[PDB]
Each structure stands twice: as structure tokens, then as C-alpha cells.
């Protein structure tokens, strides 16, 4: 259980350092929506219409 939890929280595609240059930059990172990830689509697999 702890192994899976730490694996997800530490080493994952959607888990990354929050940009701390400015307060607004942190806010934008917090409110960010990604189409990639495990259940998402890869970059080259994307197309113009997506």
C-alpha cells in the first residue's frame, strides 16, 4: 500500500515541482489541465483537431 502510494505521489507524470517564480505562476500550475498522462494521449499520437 505504501509502495503504491509513494510511487504515485513521488514518481508520476502528473506529479511535478510547482513553479515558484511568482504567486501567479504557482496559481496557474495549480489550475492546470493536461490531456497527457497514463490514461491520456501521447504527444505524437495527438492531431490537429485535438
Amino acid at each position: 500500500i505504501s509502495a503504491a502510494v509513494k510511487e504515485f505521489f513521488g514518481s508520476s507524470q502528473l506529479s511535478q515541482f510547482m513553479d515558484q517564480n511568482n504567486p501567479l505562476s504557482e496559481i496557474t500550475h495549480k489550475r492546470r489541465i493536461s490531456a497527457l498522462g497514463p490514461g491520456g494521449l501521447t504527444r505524437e499520437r495527438a492531431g490537429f483537431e485535438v
Binding site: 490531456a35 498522462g37 490514461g39 491520456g40
Partner: protein, 50 residues
């Protein structure tokens, strides 16, 4: 990501270069195997499981 459910597509109707539009149906669960229903240029039901 894409919500689980049933979705119908037509692959834009340019696969066989004959102007034939091919319609397909797809079922996505939250977890499990997938289900496909397709139409060949000869108009016969085909099922692509997983």
C-alpha cells in the same frame, strides 16, 4: 480524458479510397477490456474485442 461510455465514429469516410464511409461503435469502461463494432466495405458486422 475521455469519459467511459459508448461512442460512434466514422473515420472521416476516407479509408478505402472508394468514397465509402465506415461507421464504428466503441465501448469504454472505467477498467476492463474494450469492445468494438465495425463495418467493412462489404457491410458486414465485425467485432474487435480488446
Amino acid at each position: 480524458h475521455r469519459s467511459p461510455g459508448v461512442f460512434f465514429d466514422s473515420d472521416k469516410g476516407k479509408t478505402h479510397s472508394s468514397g465509402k464511409v465506415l461507421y464504428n461503435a466503441r465501448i469504454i469502461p472505467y477498467r476492463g477490456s474494450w469492445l468494438d463494432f465495425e463495418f467493412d466495405p462489404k457491410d458486414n458486422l465485425f467485432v474487435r474485442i480488446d
